[PDB]
Design a binder for this molecule. Sequence first.
Ligand code: HEC
Ligand code: HEM
Ligand code: HEM
Ligand code: HEM
Ligand code: HEM
Ligand code: FES
Lengths: 65, 57, 75, 48, 140, 101, 98, 378, 108, 238
Amino acid sequence: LVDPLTTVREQCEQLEKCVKARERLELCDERVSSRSQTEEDCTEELFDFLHARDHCVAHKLFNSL
Amino acid sequence: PTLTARLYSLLFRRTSTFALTIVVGALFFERAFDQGADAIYEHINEGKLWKHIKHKY
Amino acid sequence: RQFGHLTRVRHVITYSLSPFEQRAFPHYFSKGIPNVLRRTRACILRVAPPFVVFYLVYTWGTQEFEKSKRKNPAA
Amino acid sequence: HTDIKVPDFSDYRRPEVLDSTKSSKESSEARKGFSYLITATTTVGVAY
Amino acid sequence: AKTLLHQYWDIPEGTECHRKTYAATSIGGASGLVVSAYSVALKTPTSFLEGVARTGRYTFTAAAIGAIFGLTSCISAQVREKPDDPLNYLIGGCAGGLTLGARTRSYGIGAAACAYMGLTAALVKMGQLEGWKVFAEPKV
Amino acid sequence: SSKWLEGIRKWYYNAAGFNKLGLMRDDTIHENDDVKEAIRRLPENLYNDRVFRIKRALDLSMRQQILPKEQWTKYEEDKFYLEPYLKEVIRERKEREEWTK
Amino acid sequence: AAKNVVSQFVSSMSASADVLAMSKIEIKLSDIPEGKNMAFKWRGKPLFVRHRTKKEIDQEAAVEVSQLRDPQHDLERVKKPEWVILIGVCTHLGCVPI
Amino acid sequence: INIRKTHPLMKIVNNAFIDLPAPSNISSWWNFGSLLGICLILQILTGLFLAMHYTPDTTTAFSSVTHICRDVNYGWIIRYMHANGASMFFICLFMHVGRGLYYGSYTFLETWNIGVILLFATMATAFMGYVLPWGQMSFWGATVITNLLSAIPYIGTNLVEWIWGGFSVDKATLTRFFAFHFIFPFIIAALAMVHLLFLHETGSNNPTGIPSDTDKIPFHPYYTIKDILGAILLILILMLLVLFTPDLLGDPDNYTPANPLNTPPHIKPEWYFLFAYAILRSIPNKLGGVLALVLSILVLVIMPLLHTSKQRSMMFRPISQCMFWILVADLLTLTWIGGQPVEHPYIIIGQLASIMYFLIILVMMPVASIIENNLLKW
Amino acid sequence: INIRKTHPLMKIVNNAFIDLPAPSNISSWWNFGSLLGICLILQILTGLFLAMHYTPDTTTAFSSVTHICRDVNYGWIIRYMHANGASMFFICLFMHVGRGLYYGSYTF
Amino acid sequence: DLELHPPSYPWSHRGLLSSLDHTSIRRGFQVYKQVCSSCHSMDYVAYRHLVGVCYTEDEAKALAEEVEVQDGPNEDGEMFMRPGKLSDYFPKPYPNPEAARAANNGALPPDLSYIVRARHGGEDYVFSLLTGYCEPPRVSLREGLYFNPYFPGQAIGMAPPIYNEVLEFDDGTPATMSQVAKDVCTFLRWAAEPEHDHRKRMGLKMLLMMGLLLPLVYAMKRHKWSVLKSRKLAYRPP
Ligand code: HEC
Ligand code: HEM
Ligand code: HEM
Ligand code: HEM
Ligand code: HEM
Ligand code: FES
C-alpha cells in the first residue's frame, strides 16, 4: 500500500544542496515567523528546492513501478 | 561486373523494358520492404503494441 | 533572352570529358574535406562575432529576468 | 595550331578506363549499366 | 595586479557572464603591455612607429587569447551546467592556444600551444578548486 | 603617416578575396550603361584577356575552389586600365547634364 | 452608376443587420464580495463589474493628479468608492486587462 | 523541325524552363526559388483537402478541426502538413529574401518591387489562415492585430469596423477570413509568374556579381536535377517535423476553444511574425508604432536605392558582409524579443535592437559603401 | 520610345489588347468572347461576396443563404446577380459556340 | 509569483520511436471512468476509437452500454434515452459550463481532449500537478483553494484523488500513487494523439526511404554535374 513515490522522495534528499536550501528556507521562515506581519513570505526558496528535489527524485523514479 | 553488363544488355537497353523493369522492382520491393519495416517496428517494442496482448486475451 | 547572341569570345579552347568515362566522386574524402575546411576558414571570423554577442546578450537577458523577478528583499 | 594537346584526366578516369591501351568496347555495357542501375533504383524509390 | 585578478576570480563560475570576458581582456591588455615593454626596451625599434606597432601586436594578441579563453569558459559553464571540472577550462586553454597559432599564422605553434595552455588552464582552475596558496604559507 | 594608409590598403586587398580567384581590379565592376560603354570601348587584346580571367573565375567558383598560392595577382601590379575610359564616359555624362541644364 | 455599385459592395461588406441588434444589460450586485470583478459579456466586449477593496482605495487615493499623462480622478468618473463598472477593454487594442 | 519550338505553349515553356540560360556557378542558395514554388503548390493542395473537410463557424470551427484531426483518415497529416508547410514556406522565404539582399541581386528593380508585393501577400495569407482554427491564441491575436489596423486616425477606425463585419470579432469575421485565406494564394501564384517573367527578361545573377554572360549552361538537365534534389531535402525536413515534433512549432494556446474572457499572458503571435511584432510594441506610441512597422517593410522596398558601391557582390567586401551578419543577428534578437514577455530589460534591449535594425540599413551599409568606394582608388 | 512596346508586361498587353490585327468585318456575333470574360469575372466577384457570407453545412446552408437574403446589405441583389449571371453566362456560351460552328472557325 | 518549471521523466514513450503501452492505456481509461469522469468532460473521443487500442470490440460495447445517453427525439418527439454502443461520445457530466462553475468553487474544470498538448508542457505537467500538493507559508487560502506549486497562482479548486479513491484495478497491480497517476497521464497522452504509433511507423518508413533514396539522388546530381567539374579551359590567341 506504500507507494515508491514517497520512498524515493524520502530517499533522494539524504545530504544535498536540497538540504542546504531547506536550511535556507527555515532561516527565512524564522525571519517570517519572528517578525509580525510584514510583506516578505519566504516562498521563493520553497519553490526552487522543491524543483530540485523533484528532479533528483525523477532521476530514479521509474524503477519499481 | 559482367553481371551488371548483362543486366544492361537484358533490362536497360530498351525504354518500355526499362519502365516495366522498374514497375516489377518497385512492386516487389514495396511488398517485402513494408514487411521488413513492420517487423522492425514490432521488434523495437515487442511488448507494447495492442496486437499481441489482444490475442493473448 | 535567347541563347546565342550573348557576347563575343575568341581565343578560347574548352576541353571537357564525358560523364561516363570519369568517375562519380574523385578523391571525395581526400580533397573535399580540406575544401570544406578552407571554406569555413574564409567566413567564421566575420560570421561568429554577431552570433556569440547575440548569445551572451541572450544569457544576460534570461539572467536579468530571473534575478529581477526574484527579488529577495530585507524584511 | 597543331600543338593542341589534351591535359590528361588520369585523376578523374574510372578504373576500367585508366588503361590508355586496352579497348573500350567490352568495358562499355558494365559501366553504362551501373550508372543506369543507380538511376533505376532512384526511380524505384521515387515511384514508391 | 591583485585587484583585477581578484575581480576575475571573485565571479562565481557559475555564470555572471560577459564580466568574465571583460576581466579576461583586461588581463590580456596588462600582460601584453608588460612583455611589450620589455621588448621595446630591448630591441630599439627605429622607427618609433614600429615600436608602437610591436607593442600593439603584443597587447592585441594577449587580449585576444584572454577573450577567447573567457568566451569558451562562459559557454562551457552554461552548457555543461557542472561548474566544478577543469575540463571546461581544458577546452579553454586549447582554444586560446589555437588562436595564438592563428594570429601568428603557423599551425604547429598552435598545436603545442593548445596542449600546454590547456594543461596549464586545467591546473589553474583545479588548483583554485582545491586550494593551493599563492607563493607561500609562509609559516611552518 | 602615408605609409600606414598604404599598409591598410595592402591588407584590405589581400582580405578582399578577388586575388584568390586570379581576378584583377577592373573586372568586378557593376554595370550601369556607363560601364557598358567603357566595356564597349576597350582595345581588343585586353578585352580578350578580361574575358579569359572572368571565365576562369566563374569556373573556379563553379567548383567552389580557390587557385594555388603562386597564381595570385599581387598588389599594385594589376593593370588599372578601366579608370581612364570610365572616367571619360562619366565626364561626358556630366557634360550632357551641365549642357542641358 | 459605378459609385452606386461601389457603395453597394462597400455596404455589403460593412456590417450585418442582425449583429446590429445589440441590447441593454441588467446586472445583479449582491453576489459580488470585496475585490471581486465579475466579467459579464455585452456588445461583444467584457463588462467588468467590480466591488473593489478599501486597501486598493488607499492605493488609488495615493495616485497623484498632475504626474499622469491624463488625470481622470476616480471621484470624477464613478458614484461609489468601492464599486466600479467598466467596459473591460484596454483602449490600445482591446484585450482583456486581467 | 521540332515541336518543342513550334507549339506555342511549349515555345514559352522551352524558353522558360528548358533552354533557360542560367549561369554556370549557382551555389546552394538559388534553389530556394524552386523550393518556394514547391512549398506553395503543396500548400495549395493540402489546403484544398482541408477545404473539403471544414465547416467554418464560431460554434463549429474547433469541432470541425478536431473532426479532421481524428475521423477523416490521414487528415491529421494533412493538417500538420499545412501548418508546418507554412512554417517551411516562411523559412525558405526569408532565405530567398536574404539571398536577394546579400548577393547584390536587388539591382533588378521591378522584379524586386514585385517581390515586396509577394511578401505582403504571403503575410496576409498566413495571418488569415492563422485566424482560421478559432482557438484562444487565434482569437486574441485577431483582436490585437485588427485594432492595430485601427490605429490610423479618422478612417482607420471605420476601416476596422468595415473589415470586422461586426462590432467585435464575430462569425462574419471568421468567414471573411476563410474566403480571403482561400483566394489569396492564387494571386500569389500569378504574381510569382510575373516575378519569374521579369527575371527571365532582365537576366539571372551569378554569386560573384560579375556579368556572367559568357559561361551559360541551359536549365535542363542540370538545375532540374539540382532542384529535384532540393525538393527532396524539403520533403525530408518537412516529414521529419510532421512525424517527430509537431510541437516544435505548435502553440499550447491554440488547442483550447476561444474563451473570449480569459486572455492568457502567453499572448505571442505566430512565431515568424515575432521579428516585427516586437518592433510594434517597442515604440510607446500607437500611430507611430504601426507606421514604424509598415516603414520597416518599406525599408525593404527602398533597399535598392542606397547601393552606391561599385562592386555588387558581398563575397568581395568584408565590411558590408560584417554589417550584414550583424543584421542577421539583429533580426534573430528581435524575434526573440517578440518571443518573450513584457518587462524592463527586454524593453531596453528591444528598443536598442530596433534602432540597430534601422541603423544598420540606413546608415552603415551606405557608409561602408563610401569607404570601400574610397579605399581602393574607385 | 514607348513603354507599350518594350516593357515586358506591356509587350504582352500590346499583343493582347492594343494591336491585335482583327478583321474589319465582324458584326456583333463576335462580341461574345469578351462578353463571356466579363460575365466570368463578374461571376467570380458575386460568388466571392457570397462565400464571404455563407456557411457550408446542411444544418446551416439554407439558413445561411436566407441570411444573405435578409441581413446582408444588398445581399439579395448579390445572390441574384450570381444566379442570373450564371444563366446569362450559359446563354452567351451557346452564342459563342453557335458562331464558331456557323462561320467556319472550327477549322482551327 | 513564479512559474515552477516541471521536470522531465524517462517515459515509456519519451524516445522518438516508442509506442504506447496499451495495457497502461486500458487501466488509464479505467481510472478515467472511475474518478476522472465526474468533473472533467472529454467530448472529442467516441467509444469506437477505443476499438483497436486498449479494449476489444465487445467488452467496450458493453462498457458503453453501462452508461445511459439521454438521446434526442423519437416517434412522439419529446424524449427517450439510449443504451449507447459505438457512435457515442463520453457523456458530459456537467451540461453547462455555468453549471460546472456553480458545482465547484467557481473555476470550471477544463475539458480533457487536448490537455497534454495544450498546457505548456506535456503529461509531465499533468503528473507533477497531480502529485505536487503541499502547504503554504501564509497565503490568503480562500476557503476551498488547495496550494499547489505546479500551477500559475497555485490555487486549485480540485480535490486530489492522487491516492484518494483507490479503485480496485481489474488485474491486481498495486494501487499506489505513481502507478495510477502515470497510467492515467499515459491515457491522456493517447487521448491527445490518436495517431502516435501509426505516426512513428510512417516516420520510420520515411527514415528508411531517406537513408535509402537520398544518396542515390545526390550521386546522380554529382554524376551529371561531373562534366562541369572536370572541364578545363585554355587560352588561344594569335
Ligand atoms: C472535481 C472535484 C474534479 C475531479 C474528480 C478532478 N478534477 Fe481536475 N480539476 C477540477 C477543477 C474544478 C479544476 C479547475 C481549477 C484549477 O484548474 O485549479 C481542475 C483542473 C484540472 C486540470 C487543469 C490544469 C491546468 O489548467 O493546466 C487538469 C489537467 C485536471 N484537472 C485533471 C484531472 C484529472 C486527470 C482528474 C482525474 C484524476 C481530475 N482532474 C479529477 C476538478 C476536478
Ligand atoms: C489556397 C490554398 C489554401 C487553402 C485552401 C488553405 C486552407 C486552409 C485551411 C482550411 C486552414 C485551416 C486548417 C487548420 O488551421 O487546421 C488553413 C490554415 C492555415 N493556412 Fe492555409 N490554405 C491555403 C494556402 C495557404 C498558404 C499559401 C499558406 C501560407 C504558407 C497557408 C498558411 C496557413 C496557416 C499558417 C494556417 C494555420 C495552420 C493552423 O493553425 O493549423 N495556407 N489553410
Ligand atoms: C512569392 C515568393 C517568391 C517566389 C516563389 C519567388 C520565386 C523566385 C524564383 C523561382 C526565382 C528564380 C530563382 C533562380 O533563378 O535561381 C526568383 C528569383 C529572384 N527573386 Fe524571387 N520569389 C519570391 C519572392 C521574392 C521576394 C520577396 C524577393 C525580394 C524582393 C525576390 C527577389 C528575387 C530575386 C532578386 C531573384 C533573382 C535571383 C538571382 O538571379 O540572383 N523574390 N524568385
Ligand atoms: C470558357 C468560355 C469561353 C471563353 C471565355 C472563350 C473566349 C474566347 C475569346 C475571348 C475568343 C476570342 C474573341 C472571340 O472570337 O469571341 C474566343 C474565340 C474562339 N472560341 Fe472561345 N471561349 C470560350 C469557350 C469556347 C468554346 C466552348 C468553344 C468551342 C469549342 C470556343 C471556340 C472558339 C473559337 C472557334 C474561337 C475563334 C473564333 C474567332 O475569333 O473567329 N470557345 N473565345
Ligand atoms: C470561384 C468563383 C465562384 C464562387 C466563389 C462561387 C460561390 C458560390 C456560392 C457560395 C454559391 C452558393 C450560394 C447560392 O447560390 O445561394 C454559388 C452558387 C452558384 N454558383 Fe457560384 N461561385 C463561383 C463561380 C461561379 C461560376 C463561374 C458560375 C457559373 C457561371 C457559378 C454558378 C453558380 C450557380 C448556378 C449557383 C447556384 C445558384 C442558385 O441556384 O442559388 N458560380 N456559387
Ligand atoms: S496594452 Fe496593448 S492592448 Fe492593453
